Design a binder for this molecule. Structure first.
Ligand code: NA
Length: 273
């Protein structure tokens, strides 16, 4: 069963903030090394149509670190527990979840436990798995390169941030943007960041996909170091009821760089599913 905390309890624990208005509610879930502030480019349009709920994963942003554990948050199932607990505790129903990157998988795990409160998922630049299993799956990242990334976190954290920020944001983008991500990386507790990075880039959730029965809208970045169009394509083929749209853009953060491209589309999806 899913624990039900006092509404009062999850709010402070997850730094929950509610804006907009109306009966239809959307829940926005951030990606690795970020927080709810990365949604600020989409919020205004979303708030014209929905009640918008944002939050910080325990350990992330301004969430309560007192709730963080390396045990629970060792894998994405502990993150999914965050979502399941917020939905149960606020007793929300008919929620559309919009997830960035890893939150695409987290939302999907949560939908296997509390599917009854979730109407659909929107997945922005998702990946089920970053490693390669050729020929039939190429996550795009060799084990040797991933080993080197996680290890760089131990040797030189500032170096790690400077390397990964442009990778995720897309090197063609502004210093303001890339720099915002490296700053977020830097201000995130190093143990949270290290265990979240392993749970994100070292996991394999391809077998999950066929068990996601919730309608899923996938946005695939046309040029994405972290996830090629074949990754998005693979996902749509395996999530039973899914729909992929390819977006002409660069980087792994379309909700930040190209909110104008994806927002009207996901709004239409959530309104008419
Ligand atoms: Na609506």
């Amino acid at each position: 069963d899913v624990i039900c905390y006092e509404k009062e309890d999850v709010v402070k624990r997850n730094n929950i903030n509610i804006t907009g208005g109306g009966e239809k509610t959307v829940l926005l879930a951030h990606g690795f090394g970020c927080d709810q502030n990365m949604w600020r480019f989409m919020l205004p349009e979303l708030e014209k149509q929905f009640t918008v709920i944002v939050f910080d994963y325990v350990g992330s942003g301004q969430s309560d670190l007192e709730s963080f554990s390396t045990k629970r948050y060792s894998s994405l199932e502990g993150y999914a527990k965050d979502v399941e607990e917020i939905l149960v505790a606020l007793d929300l129903v008919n929620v559309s979840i919009i997830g960035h990157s890893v939150s695409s998988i987290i939302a999907g795990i949560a939908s296997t436990h509390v599917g009854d409160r979730i109407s659909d998922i929107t997945m922005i630049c998702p990946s089920p798995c970053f490693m390669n299993f050729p020929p039939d799956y190429v996550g795009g990242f060799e084990r040797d390169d991933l080993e080197e990334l996680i290890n760089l976190m131990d040797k030189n954290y500032i170096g790690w941030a400077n390397y990964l920020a442009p990778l995720v944001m897309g090197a063609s983008h502004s210093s303001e943007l890339i720099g915002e991500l490296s700053g977020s990386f830097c201000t995130t507790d190093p143990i949270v960041a290290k265990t979240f990075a392993k749970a994100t880039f070292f996991s394999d959730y391809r077998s999950l996909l066929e068990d996601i029965s919730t309608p899923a809208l996938i946005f695939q970045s046309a040029k994405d170091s972290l996830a090629s169009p074949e990754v998005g394509q693979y996902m749509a083929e395996n999530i039973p009821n899914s729909q992929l749209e390819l977006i002409q853009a660069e980087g792994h953060c379309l909700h930040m760089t190209d909110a104008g491209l994806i927002t009207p589309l996901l709004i239409h999806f959530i309104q008419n599913n």
